Amino acid sequence: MIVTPASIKALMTSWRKDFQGGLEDAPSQYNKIAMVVNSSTRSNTYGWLGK
Amino acid sequence: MIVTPASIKALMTSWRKDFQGGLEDAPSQYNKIAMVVNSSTRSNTYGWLGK
């Protein structure tokens, strides 16, 4: 039996990438309650007329 | 009545291979809760990056 040191025995591992994405984020569900509007300048102004 | 010895009349039986199966063992159901990876050294090292 060859008495190898501790560091050499610790280097004798194989790298596996099964844990790559970590834990996935929660589902996205903001489109159900919000209205999406695109702005083109410094700010948007909205205006409506009373009855 | 013919007096046959016990050694001759002990051969007067029928061999049946009906118990050959025996008692079956429990089902394998480790594939629903575990993931199978391979290895090629003393151990396996897994690493992932944070968010």
Author numbering:
A (entry chain B), B (entry chain C): 1 to 51
Direct quotes from the study:
Using icosahedral reconstruction method, a 4.2 Å resolution map of the extended Mu head was generated. The local reconstruction method was employed to improve the resolution of the 3-fold capsid of the head to 3.2 Å. The Mu head is constituted by 415 copies of the MCP gp34, which are organized into 11 pentons and 60 hexons, thereby forming an icosahedral shell with a triangulation number of seven. The MCP gp34 adopts a canonical HK97-like fold. According to the domain nomenclature of MCP gp5 of HK97, each gp34 can be divided into four domains: N-arm, E-loop, P-domain, and A-domain. An asymmetric unit of the icosahedral head comprises seven gp34 monomers (one hexon and one-fifth of a penton). The superimposition of the seven gp34 monomers in an asymmetric unit revealed considerable conformational changes in the N-arms and E-loops, which ultimately led to the formation of capsomers, hexons, and pentons that are assembled into the icosahedral capsid. Despite the absence of cement proteins at inter-capsomere interfaces, complex and extensive interactions are observed around the 3-fold and the quasi-3-fold axes, including hydrogen bonds, salt bridges, and electrostatic interactions. Analogous interactions that reinforce the inter-capsomere stability within the head, independent of cement proteins, have been identified in A-1(L), T7 (47), and R4C.
Myophage Mu is a representative of contractile nanomachines with a simple tail baseplate. It has the capacity to infect a range of intestinal bacteria and has extensive applications in genetic engineering research. Using cryo-EM, we resolved the three-dimensional (3D) structures of the G(+) type phage Mu in both its extended state and urea-induced contracted state, the latter lacking the baseplate, at near-atomic resolutions. The structure of extended Mu can be divided into four distinct regions: the DNA-containing head, the connector complex, the tail, and the baseplate.
